[PDB]
């Protein structure tokens, strides 16, 4: 008809309205999370790259002593080879225990 | 009245225009807080796996340099000269080899 | 933006207008019936000119013709007579407004 | 539901325009026409008075005349009365054709 048609588009505008609003909060809230989460992002990359280094160090250093070790030991007795050969073959042997043991330390 | 009629079209047409828009660009949002959400999980379980690595080589590492400490004194004088020198040679990175050693990784 | 005060502008002006389509309907259809009664009252007031005017040319023929008569047999009577004739047509044709409301209200106390 | 309601308001509006138009020409038109009718009106009833005065005026000196002629018919002749009487009685007798041609004189007169 004509008045309640007039009501009609009234009642649809506040709906529409509605919507907007709520989809400009839920937006807002995408804005944020967004952000926080670039930043979560970049701090654990720089984490990620920062550890490879020392991971890639440690690794190179352990080669070299190994190499050492491995160069110096038949400059020894028989019975110290016999000792220092199963010495390495166990400080090569790292479990998930003493890791996990050792980190605590390291976070306390 | 024609002249207040048009206000609501008008109107109407700036409003949905507003919402569209708006609808697009939060949608490209999802994609990308979702998007930037899958790299932050991978560079966190990057972070993860690689402290272990790491952690495990340095112990690794200290026990190597425990051993080759108390194997040095029952060693001789001329040589625990070189292996001392050498110890200290090993324990010893600057950027350089790191370099060299990633480059060498990465092919 | 000012879409509620917008909105109910044009139902404000909508029953406005239709308030005075209302008014004027009523008015025109009062007029037409006002309109009826003017021509009625009109073909009444002509069809009686009509009728009546016949009627006083008539009469006025007819007293015209009564008139020629006792003129014209004024001489033919006594002498000492005609001169009282000759005076009762004088004031015969003369009629007073007194005598014409005395007609009229005889005749249409008359009609009753 | 907006586009195709618009469209509605606006149409519809038109329409009332129209009606409210033609409406307001049919009083203008009804406004002159009963003024129109009102005008004759009040002309035929004064020509309706004013000739009814007349008329009575007429139909008065005739009843008198009449009188007069009834008062001095038996002083007149004997012989005489026997025409008088038949003069009357065609004078108070106007037939259609009478009307007609005295009416036509007094237009084509003046």
Do not use: W
Request: negative net charge; hydrophobic residues 35%.
């Amino acid at each position: 008809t004509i008045p309640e048609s007039l009501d009609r588009i009234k009642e649809e505008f506040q709906f529409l309205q509605a919507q907007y609003h709520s989809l400009k909060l839920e937006c807002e809230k995408l804005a944020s999370e967004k952000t926080e989460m670039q930043r979560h992002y970049v701090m654990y990359y720089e984490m990620s790259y920062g550890l490879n280094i020392e991971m890639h160090k440690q690794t190179e250093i352990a080669k070299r002593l190994n190499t050492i070790c491995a160069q110096v030991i038949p400059f020894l007795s028989q019975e110290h080879q016999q000792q220092v050969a199963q010495a390495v073959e166990r400080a090569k042997q790292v479990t998930m225990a003493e890791l996990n043991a050792i980190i605590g330390q390291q976070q306390l």
